[PDB]
Amino acid sequence: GFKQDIATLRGDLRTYAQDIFLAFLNKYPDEKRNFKNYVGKSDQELKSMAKFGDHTEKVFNLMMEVADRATDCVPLASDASTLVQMKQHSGLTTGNFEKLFVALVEYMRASGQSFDSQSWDRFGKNLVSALSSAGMK
Ligand code: HEM
Ligand SMILES: Cc1cc(Cl)ccc1O
């Protein structure tokens, strides 16, 4: 289930973090409006860009903590408030999060592994609801 999936992702987190973020950028290329330095790069070129690797790992490190602190895929209100109030998120709306979770779930469904894709779909929807209640547009 969901808690085992957190353990699976954490066991290879740099690889999962990069491949999920690339699945997102490749599914929604207009999302590079928020990542202008990632334009005109293949996946292999992005992986060899220092900030791409370091920011994607730090995003997925925190995402796994938010997932781990969740009850039945419902994140803590404190984690939603933190995500809304981060200066690095000043540009964002809940639709950016929705797209990330649509890409993550499709990535999981395409994997050979027994990921609980329906729990990740719930988690993404519940995080979006929590972000809106914490003040994200
Ligand atoms: C649960 C989901 C997410 C978590 C846990 C999260 C977490 C973080 C963290 C920890 C940072 C600091 C990274 C660093 O400076 O090294 C960060 C920066 C950032 N996050 Fe988020 N994030 C999430 C979703 C998103 C989404 C959906 C977007 C846009 C589609 C986004 C855009 C950014 C941007 C633009 C930065 C600053 C630019 C950059 O670091 O390259 N994040 N995020
Ligand atoms: C800044 C950032 C955002 C997301 Cl959603 C994924 C990876 C990253 O490096």
Short mmCIF file of all heavy atoms in Angstrom, two decimals, residues 21 24-25 31 34-35 37-38 51-67 83 86-101 123 127 131 136, ligand 1:
data_model
loop_
_atom_site.label_atom_id
_atom_site.label_comp_id
_atom_site.label_asym_id
_atom_site.label_seq_id
_atom_site.Cartn_x
_atom_site.Cartn_y
_atom_site.Cartn_z
N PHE A 21 9.81 13.60 -11.87
CA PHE A 21 9.81 15.01 -12.31
C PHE A 21 9.92 15.08 -13.84
O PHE A 21 9.25 15.92 -14.43
CB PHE A 21 10.95 15.74 -11.65
CG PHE A 21 10.96 17.23 -11.91
CD1 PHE A 21 9.82 17.99 -11.84
CD2 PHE A 21 12.15 17.87 -12.20
CE1 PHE A 21 9.86 19.35 -12.04
CE2 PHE A 21 12.21 19.24 -12.39
CZ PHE A 21 11.05 19.97 -12.33
N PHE A 24 6.59 14.37 -15.36
CA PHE A 24 5.80 15.60 -15.22
C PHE A 24 6.15 16.59 -16.32
O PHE A 24 5.25 17.09 -17.02
CB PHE A 24 5.98 16.15 -13.82
CG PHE A 24 5.53 17.57 -13.66
CD1 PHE A 24 4.18 17.91 -13.61
CD2 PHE A 24 6.47 18.55 -13.35
CE1 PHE A 24 3.79 19.20 -13.36
CE2 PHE A 24 6.08 19.86 -13.13
CZ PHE A 24 4.74 20.18 -13.16
N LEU A 25 7.43 16.92 -16.44
CA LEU A 25 7.82 17.96 -17.43
C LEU A 25 7.50 17.52 -18.85
O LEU A 25 7.20 18.36 -19.70
CB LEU A 25 9.30 18.27 -17.29
CG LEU A 25 9.73 18.97 -16.01
CD1 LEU A 25 11.26 19.13 -15.98
CD2 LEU A 25 9.05 20.31 -15.87
N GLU A 31 4.67 23.53 -18.34
CA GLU A 31 5.05 23.70 -16.91
C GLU A 31 6.48 24.24 -16.79
O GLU A 31 6.84 24.68 -15.70
CB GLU A 31 4.80 22.42 -16.12
CG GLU A 31 3.30 22.15 -15.93
CD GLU A 31 2.61 23.05 -14.95
OE1 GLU A 31 3.05 23.12 -13.82
OE2 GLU A 31 1.63 23.71 -15.36
N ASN A 34 7.81 27.65 -15.22
CA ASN A 34 8.26 27.79 -13.81
C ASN A 34 9.68 27.26 -13.66
O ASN A 34 10.24 27.41 -12.56
CB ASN A 34 7.30 27.13 -12.82
CG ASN A 34 6.07 27.98 -12.59
OD1 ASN A 34 6.15 29.20 -12.47
ND2 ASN A 34 4.91 27.36 -12.54
N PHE A 35 10.29 26.78 -14.75
CA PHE A 35 11.61 26.10 -14.75
C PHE A 35 12.35 26.48 -16.04
O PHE A 35 12.71 25.57 -16.81
CB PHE A 35 11.44 24.58 -14.64
CG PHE A 35 10.67 24.09 -13.44
CD1 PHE A 35 9.38 23.62 -13.57
CD2 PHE A 35 11.24 24.11 -12.19
CE1 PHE A 35 8.66 23.21 -12.46
CE2 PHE A 35 10.53 23.67 -11.09
CZ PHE A 35 9.24 23.24 -11.22
N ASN A 37 15.26 27.38 -16.94
CA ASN A 37 16.62 26.85 -17.19
C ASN A 37 16.56 25.40 -17.67
O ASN A 37 17.63 24.91 -18.11
CB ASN A 37 17.50 26.98 -15.95
CG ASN A 37 17.62 28.41 -15.47
OD1 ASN A 37 17.90 29.32 -16.26
ND2 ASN A 37 17.38 28.63 -14.18
N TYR A 38 15.40 24.75 -17.64
CA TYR A 38 15.24 23.34 -18.06
C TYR A 38 14.79 23.28 -19.54
O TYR A 38 14.69 22.20 -20.15
CB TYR A 38 14.36 22.56 -17.04
CG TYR A 38 14.86 22.55 -15.60
CD1 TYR A 38 14.04 22.22 -14.51
CD2 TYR A 38 16.20 22.73 -15.31
CE1 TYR A 38 14.52 22.25 -13.19
CE2 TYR A 38 16.69 22.77 -14.01
CZ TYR A 38 15.86 22.50 -12.94
OH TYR A 38 16.44 22.55 -11.69
N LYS A 51 21.41 21.86 -10.19
CA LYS A 51 20.18 22.27 -9.45
C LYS A 51 19.05 21.29 -9.77
O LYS A 51 18.24 20.98 -8.87
CB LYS A 51 19.79 23.71 -9.81
CG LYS A 51 20.83 24.75 -9.44
CD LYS A 51 20.30 26.16 -9.48
CE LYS A 51 21.27 27.18 -8.94
NZ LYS A 51 20.89 28.55 -9.36
N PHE A 52 18.99 20.78 -10.99
CA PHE A 52 17.90 19.82 -11.32
C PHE A 52 17.97 18.65 -10.34
O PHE A 52 16.95 18.25 -9.73
CB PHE A 52 18.00 19.38 -12.77
CG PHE A 52 16.98 18.34 -13.14
CD1 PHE A 52 15.79 18.73 -13.70
CD2 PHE A 52 17.21 16.99 -12.92
CE1 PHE A 52 14.83 17.79 -14.03
CE2 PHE A 52 16.25 16.05 -13.26
CZ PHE A 52 15.07 16.46 -13.83
N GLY A 53 19.15 18.07 -10.20
CA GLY A 53 19.36 16.94 -9.28
C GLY A 53 19.10 17.35 -7.84
O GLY A 53 18.34 16.71 -7.18
N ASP A 54 19.67 18.45 -7.37
CA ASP A 54 19.60 18.82 -5.93
C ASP A 54 18.18 19.26 -5.60
O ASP A 54 17.65 18.84 -4.57
CB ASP A 54 20.67 19.85 -5.56
CG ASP A 54 20.72 20.24 -4.08
OD1 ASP A 54 21.15 19.41 -3.26
OD2 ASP A 54 20.36 21.39 -3.76
N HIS A 55 17.54 20.04 -6.46
CA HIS A 55 16.16 20.51 -6.16
C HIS A 55 15.21 19.33 -6.26
O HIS A 55 14.28 19.20 -5.42
CB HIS A 55 15.80 21.73 -7.00
CG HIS A 55 16.70 22.90 -6.74
ND1 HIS A 55 16.36 24.18 -7.09
CD2 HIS A 55 17.94 22.99 -6.19
CE1 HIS A 55 17.31 25.00 -6.72
NE2 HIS A 55 18.31 24.30 -6.21
N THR A 56 15.39 18.45 -7.24
CA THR A 56 14.41 17.35 -7.37
C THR A 56 14.55 16.43 -6.14
O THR A 56 13.50 15.98 -5.62
CB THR A 56 14.58 16.71 -8.75
OG1 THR A 56 14.40 17.77 -9.70
CG2 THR A 56 13.61 15.56 -8.95
N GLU A 57 15.77 16.20 -5.66
CA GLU A 57 15.93 15.33 -4.47
C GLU A 57 15.27 16.01 -3.26
O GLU A 57 14.61 15.35 -2.47
CB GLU A 57 17.41 15.01 -4.22
CG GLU A 57 17.54 13.94 -3.18
CD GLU A 57 18.72 12.98 -3.25
OE1 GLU A 57 19.79 13.37 -3.75
OE2 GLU A 57 18.53 11.85 -2.78
N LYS A 58 15.49 17.30 -3.07
CA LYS A 58 14.93 17.97 -1.89
C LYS A 58 13.41 18.01 -1.98
O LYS A 58 12.76 17.80 -0.95
CB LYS A 58 15.57 19.33 -1.74
CG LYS A 58 16.98 19.21 -1.23
CD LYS A 58 17.64 20.51 -1.12
CE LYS A 58 19.02 20.35 -0.53
NZ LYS A 58 19.87 21.54 -0.83
N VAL A 59 12.85 18.18 -3.17
CA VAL A 59 11.37 18.13 -3.32
C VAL A 59 10.87 16.77 -2.87
O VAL A 59 9.92 16.70 -2.06
CB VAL A 59 10.98 18.44 -4.78
CG1 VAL A 59 9.53 18.10 -5.04
CG2 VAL A 59 11.23 19.92 -5.09
N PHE A 60 11.44 15.70 -3.42
CA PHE A 60 10.96 14.32 -3.16
C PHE A 60 11.27 13.91 -1.71
O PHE A 60 10.49 13.14 -1.13
CB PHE A 60 11.47 13.36 -4.23
CG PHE A 60 10.56 13.40 -5.43
CD1 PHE A 60 10.61 14.47 -6.33
CD2 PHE A 60 9.57 12.45 -5.60
CE1 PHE A 60 9.77 14.53 -7.42
CE2 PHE A 60 8.71 12.54 -6.69
CZ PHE A 60 8.79 13.59 -7.58
N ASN A 61 12.36 14.39 -1.13
CA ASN A 61 12.63 14.14 0.31
C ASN A 61 11.44 14.67 1.10
O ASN A 61 10.93 13.95 1.99
CB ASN A 61 13.94 14.80 0.77
CG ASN A 61 15.21 14.11 0.31
OD1 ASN A 61 15.19 12.93 -0.03
ND2 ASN A 61 16.34 14.83 0.36
N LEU A 62 11.05 15.92 0.87
CA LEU A 62 9.96 16.53 1.66
C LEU A 62 8.63 15.85 1.29
O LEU A 62 7.79 15.61 2.18
CB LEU A 62 9.95 18.04 1.49
CG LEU A 62 8.86 18.75 2.27
CD1 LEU A 62 8.98 18.48 3.78
CD2 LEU A 62 8.90 20.23 1.99
N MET A 63 8.40 15.55 0.01
CA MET A 63 7.13 14.92 -0.41
C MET A 63 6.97 13.58 0.34
O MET A 63 5.87 13.30 0.84
CB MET A 63 7.06 14.69 -1.92
CG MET A 63 5.71 14.17 -2.33
SD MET A 63 5.73 13.38 -3.94
CE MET A 63 6.07 14.81 -4.96
N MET A 64 8.04 12.80 0.47
CA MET A 64 7.94 11.49 1.17
C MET A 64 7.64 11.75 2.65
O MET A 64 6.92 10.94 3.29
CB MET A 64 9.20 10.64 0.99
CG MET A 64 9.39 10.17 -0.43
SD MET A 64 7.99 9.24 -1.14
CE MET A 64 7.10 10.49 -2.08
N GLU A 65 8.18 12.83 3.26
CA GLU A 65 7.87 13.13 4.68
C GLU A 65 6.40 13.52 4.79
O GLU A 65 5.75 13.09 5.77
CB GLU A 65 8.70 14.27 5.24
CG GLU A 65 10.16 13.95 5.48
CD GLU A 65 10.84 15.22 5.91
OE1 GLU A 65 10.47 15.73 6.97
OE2 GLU A 65 11.62 15.75 5.15
N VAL A 66 5.89 14.30 3.85
CA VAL A 66 4.45 14.72 3.92
C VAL A 66 3.58 13.46 3.79
O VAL A 66 2.56 13.29 4.53
CB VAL A 66 4.12 15.78 2.87
CG1 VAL A 66 2.64 16.16 2.83
CG2 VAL A 66 4.97 17.02 3.08
N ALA A 67 3.95 12.58 2.87
CA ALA A 67 3.21 11.31 2.66
C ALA A 67 3.29 10.49 3.95
O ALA A 67 2.28 9.86 4.35
CB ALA A 67 3.73 10.52 1.50
N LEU A 83 3.97 24.28 2.70
CA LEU A 83 4.11 24.25 1.23
C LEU A 83 3.55 25.55 0.65
O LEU A 83 4.11 26.05 -0.30
CB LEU A 83 3.42 23.02 0.62
CG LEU A 83 4.11 21.69 0.91
CD1 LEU A 83 3.25 20.50 0.50
CD2 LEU A 83 5.47 21.58 0.26
N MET A 86 6.09 28.71 1.66
CA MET A 86 7.49 28.71 1.13
C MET A 86 7.64 29.80 0.06
O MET A 86 6.85 29.84 -0.88
CB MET A 86 7.77 27.36 0.46
CG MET A 86 8.12 26.28 1.38
SD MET A 86 8.10 24.71 0.46
CE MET A 86 9.51 25.01 -0.60
N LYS A 87 8.66 30.66 0.18
CA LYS A 87 8.90 31.76 -0.81
C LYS A 87 9.07 31.15 -2.21
O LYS A 87 8.58 31.76 -3.19
CB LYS A 87 10.08 32.65 -0.39
CG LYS A 87 11.42 32.35 -1.05
CD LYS A 87 11.79 33.31 -2.17
CE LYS A 87 12.82 32.73 -3.11
NZ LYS A 87 12.16 31.99 -4.21
N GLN A 88 9.66 29.95 -2.29
CA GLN A 88 9.91 29.27 -3.59
C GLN A 88 8.59 28.89 -4.27
O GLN A 88 8.63 28.64 -5.47
CB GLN A 88 10.83 28.05 -3.45
CG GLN A 88 12.31 28.42 -3.43
CD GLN A 88 13.18 27.36 -2.79
OE1 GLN A 88 12.94 26.95 -1.65
NE2 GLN A 88 14.20 26.93 -3.50
N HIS A 89 7.49 28.87 -3.55
CA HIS A 89 6.16 28.49 -4.11
C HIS A 89 5.31 29.72 -4.38
O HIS A 89 4.11 29.54 -4.64
CB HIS A 89 5.46 27.51 -3.14
CG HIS A 89 6.07 26.13 -3.19
ND1 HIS A 89 5.66 25.09 -2.39
CD2 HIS A 89 7.09 25.65 -3.95
CE1 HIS A 89 6.37 24.03 -2.67
NE2 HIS A 89 7.24 24.33 -3.66
N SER A 90 5.88 30.93 -4.36
CA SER A 90 5.07 32.17 -4.45
C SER A 90 4.30 32.20 -5.78
O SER A 90 3.17 32.70 -5.78
CB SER A 90 5.90 33.43 -4.25
OG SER A 90 6.93 33.53 -5.22
N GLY A 91 4.88 31.67 -6.86
CA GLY A 91 4.23 31.67 -8.18
C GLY A 91 3.07 30.69 -8.36
O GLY A 91 2.19 30.97 -9.17
N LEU A 92 2.96 29.69 -7.51
CA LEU A 92 2.24 28.44 -7.88
C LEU A 92 0.74 28.48 -7.56
O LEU A 92 0.29 29.28 -6.73
CB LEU A 92 2.90 27.28 -7.14
CG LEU A 92 4.38 27.10 -7.45
CD1 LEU A 92 4.87 25.81 -6.82
CD2 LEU A 92 4.68 27.10 -8.95
N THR A 93 0.00 27.61 -8.24
CA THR A 93 -1.41 27.38 -7.96
C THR A 93 -1.59 25.88 -7.74
O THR A 93 -0.65 25.09 -8.02
CB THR A 93 -2.27 27.88 -9.13
OG1 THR A 93 -1.89 27.17 -10.30
CG2 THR A 93 -2.13 29.37 -9.38
N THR A 94 -2.76 25.50 -7.28
CA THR A 94 -2.98 24.08 -7.00
C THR A 94 -2.90 23.26 -8.30
O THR A 94 -2.64 22.04 -8.21
CB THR A 94 -4.32 23.85 -6.30
OG1 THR A 94 -5.38 24.29 -7.14
CG2 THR A 94 -4.39 24.54 -4.96
N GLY A 95 -3.19 23.85 -9.45
CA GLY A 95 -3.14 23.05 -10.70
C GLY A 95 -1.73 22.56 -10.99
O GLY A 95 -1.54 21.51 -11.59
N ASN A 96 -0.70 23.29 -10.56
CA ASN A 96 0.69 22.79 -10.75
C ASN A 96 0.82 21.46 -9.97
O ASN A 96 1.48 20.53 -10.47
CB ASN A 96 1.75 23.79 -10.28
CG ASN A 96 1.72 25.15 -10.95
OD1 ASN A 96 1.47 26.16 -10.27
ND2 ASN A 96 2.01 25.21 -12.24
N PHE A 97 0.30 21.40 -8.74
CA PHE A 97 0.36 20.18 -7.90
C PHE A 97 -0.48 19.07 -8.53
O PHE A 97 -0.08 17.87 -8.53
CB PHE A 97 -0.06 20.51 -6.48
CG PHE A 97 0.98 21.30 -5.76
CD1 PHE A 97 1.11 22.67 -5.96
CD2 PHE A 97 1.87 20.68 -4.90
CE1 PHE A 97 2.09 23.40 -5.30
CE2 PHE A 97 2.84 21.41 -4.24
CZ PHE A 97 2.94 22.77 -4.42
N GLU A 98 -1.67 19.42 -8.98
CA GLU A 98 -2.54 18.41 -9.61
C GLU A 98 -1.78 17.72 -10.73
O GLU A 98 -1.75 16.49 -10.76
CB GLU A 98 -3.80 19.13 -10.06
CG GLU A 98 -4.77 18.24 -10.75
CD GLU A 98 -6.10 18.96 -10.91
OE1 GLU A 98 -6.10 20.23 -10.93
OE2 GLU A 98 -7.13 18.27 -10.96
N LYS A 99 -1.15 18.49 -11.61
CA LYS A 99 -0.42 17.94 -12.78
C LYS A 99 0.71 17.03 -12.30
O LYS A 99 0.91 15.96 -12.87
CB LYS A 99 0.05 19.09 -13.67
CG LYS A 99 -1.09 19.77 -14.41
CD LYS A 99 -0.62 20.92 -15.31
CE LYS A 99 -1.73 21.68 -16.00
NZ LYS A 99 -2.43 22.55 -15.04
N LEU A 100 1.45 17.46 -11.29
CA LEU A 100 2.54 16.62 -10.75
C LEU A 100 1.96 15.27 -10.35
O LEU A 100 2.56 14.24 -10.71
CB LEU A 100 3.18 17.32 -9.56
CG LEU A 100 4.24 16.52 -8.82
CD1 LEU A 100 5.39 16.12 -9.74
CD2 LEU A 100 4.74 17.31 -7.62
N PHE A 101 0.84 15.26 -9.65
CA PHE A 101 0.29 13.99 -9.15
C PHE A 101 -0.33 13.20 -10.29
O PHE A 101 -0.23 11.96 -10.24
CB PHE A 101 -0.59 14.16 -7.91
CG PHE A 101 0.28 14.37 -6.70
CD1 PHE A 101 0.65 15.63 -6.29
CD2 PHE A 101 0.81 13.28 -6.02
CE1 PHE A 101 1.48 15.80 -5.20
CE2 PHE A 101 1.70 13.45 -4.99
CZ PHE A 101 2.04 14.72 -4.58
N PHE A 123 -3.92 10.88 -2.46
CA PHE A 123 -2.96 11.75 -1.76
C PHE A 123 -2.84 13.09 -2.50
O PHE A 123 -2.92 14.15 -1.90
CB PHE A 123 -1.60 11.06 -1.61
CG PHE A 123 -0.54 11.90 -0.95
CD1 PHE A 123 -0.69 12.40 0.33
CD2 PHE A 123 0.64 12.17 -1.61
CE1 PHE A 123 0.30 13.17 0.92
CE2 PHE A 123 1.61 13.00 -1.05
CZ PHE A 123 1.48 13.40 0.25
N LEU A 127 -3.91 16.55 -1.01
CA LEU A 127 -2.91 17.61 -0.84
C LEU A 127 -3.44 18.87 -1.52
O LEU A 127 -3.37 19.95 -0.93
CB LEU A 127 -1.57 17.19 -1.42
CG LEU A 127 -0.45 18.20 -1.23
CD1 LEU A 127 -0.25 18.59 0.22
CD2 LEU A 127 0.82 17.67 -1.87
N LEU A 131 -3.95 22.34 0.28
CA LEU A 131 -3.20 23.56 -0.15
C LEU A 131 -4.19 24.70 -0.33
O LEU A 131 -3.92 25.85 0.05
CB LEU A 131 -2.39 23.32 -1.42
CG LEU A 131 -1.23 22.34 -1.30
CD1 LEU A 131 -0.72 21.89 -2.66
CD2 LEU A 131 -0.09 22.91 -0.46
N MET A 136 -3.46 28.51 -0.96
CA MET A 136 -2.91 28.51 -2.33
C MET A 136 -4.06 28.79 -3.31
O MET A 136 -5.15 28.23 -3.14
CB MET A 136 -2.21 27.19 -2.69
CG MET A 136 -1.54 27.25 -4.05
SD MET A 136 -0.62 25.75 -4.37
CE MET A 136 0.74 25.94 -3.21
C1 HEM B 1 4.31 17.80 -2.56
C2 HEM B 1 4.91 18.48 -3.53
C3 HEM B 1 6.10 19.37 -3.39
C4 HEM B 1 7.05 19.46 -2.42
C5 HEM B 1 7.24 18.57 -1.20
C6 HEM B 1 7.93 20.58 -2.78
C7 HEM B 1 9.05 20.93 -2.06
C8 HEM B 1 10.00 21.88 -2.45
C9 HEM B 1 11.26 22.09 -1.80
C10 HEM B 1 11.78 21.35 -0.57
C11 HEM B 1 11.90 23.10 -2.47
C12 HEM B 1 13.30 23.60 -2.09
C13 HEM B 1 14.31 23.07 -3.17
C14 HEM B 1 15.70 23.68 -3.19
O1 HEM B 1 15.83 24.92 -3.15
O2 HEM B 1 16.71 22.93 -3.34
C15 HEM B 1 11.07 23.53 -3.55
C16 HEM B 1 11.44 24.58 -4.47
C17 HEM B 1 10.63 24.75 -5.53
N1 HEM B 1 9.43 24.08 -5.78
FE1 HEM B 1 8.36 22.85 -4.78
N2 HEM B 1 7.49 21.13 -3.93
C18 HEM B 1 6.38 20.48 -4.32
C19 HEM B 1 5.66 20.75 -5.49
C20 HEM B 1 6.00 21.70 -6.44
C21 HEM B 1 5.31 21.90 -7.66
C22 HEM B 1 4.09 21.18 -8.14
C23 HEM B 1 5.97 22.94 -8.32
C24 HEM B 1 5.71 23.48 -9.69
C25 HEM B 1 5.12 22.73 -10.65
C26 HEM B 1 7.05 23.35 -7.50
C27 HEM B 1 7.94 24.39 -7.82
C28 HEM B 1 9.05 24.66 -6.98
C29 HEM B 1 9.97 25.67 -7.48
C30 HEM B 1 9.84 26.49 -8.76
C31 HEM B 1 10.97 25.75 -6.59
C32 HEM B 1 12.11 26.76 -6.73
C33 HEM B 1 12.86 26.64 -8.06
C34 HEM B 1 13.78 25.46 -7.99
O3 HEM B 1 13.96 24.95 -6.84
O4 HEM B 1 14.32 25.00 -9.03
N3 HEM B 1 7.06 22.59 -6.38
N4 HEM B 1 9.92 22.75 -3.53
#
